[PDB]
Amino acid sequence: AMFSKVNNQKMLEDCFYIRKKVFVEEQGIPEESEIDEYESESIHLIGYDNGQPVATARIRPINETTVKIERVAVMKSHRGQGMGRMLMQAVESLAKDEGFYVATMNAQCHAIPFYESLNFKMRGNIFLEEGIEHIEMTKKLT
The Cα–Cα gap between 25 and 98 comes to 32
The Cα–Cα gap between 105 and 115 comes to 10
The Cα–Cα gap between 96 and 104 comes to 13
The Cα–Cα gap between 121 and 117 comes to 10
Cβ atoms within 10 Å, residue 11: 17
Q: What are phi and psi of 49, to 5 degrees?
A: -130, 115
Cβ atoms within 10 Å, residue 78: 16
Q: Measured in Å, how far apart are the chain's first and last C-alpha atoms?
A: 25
Q: Domains (ranges, CATH) in the chain?
A: 1-142 (3.40.630.30)
Strands 52-61 and 66-74: antiparallel
Residues of the binding site for CoA: 72-74, 80, 113-115
Calculate ∠ Cα 5-22-76, nearest 5°.
90
Which resolution in angstroms does this entry have?
A: 1.8
Q: How many helices (H) and strands (E) does the chain have?
A: 4, 7
Residues of the binding site: 72-74, 80, 113-115
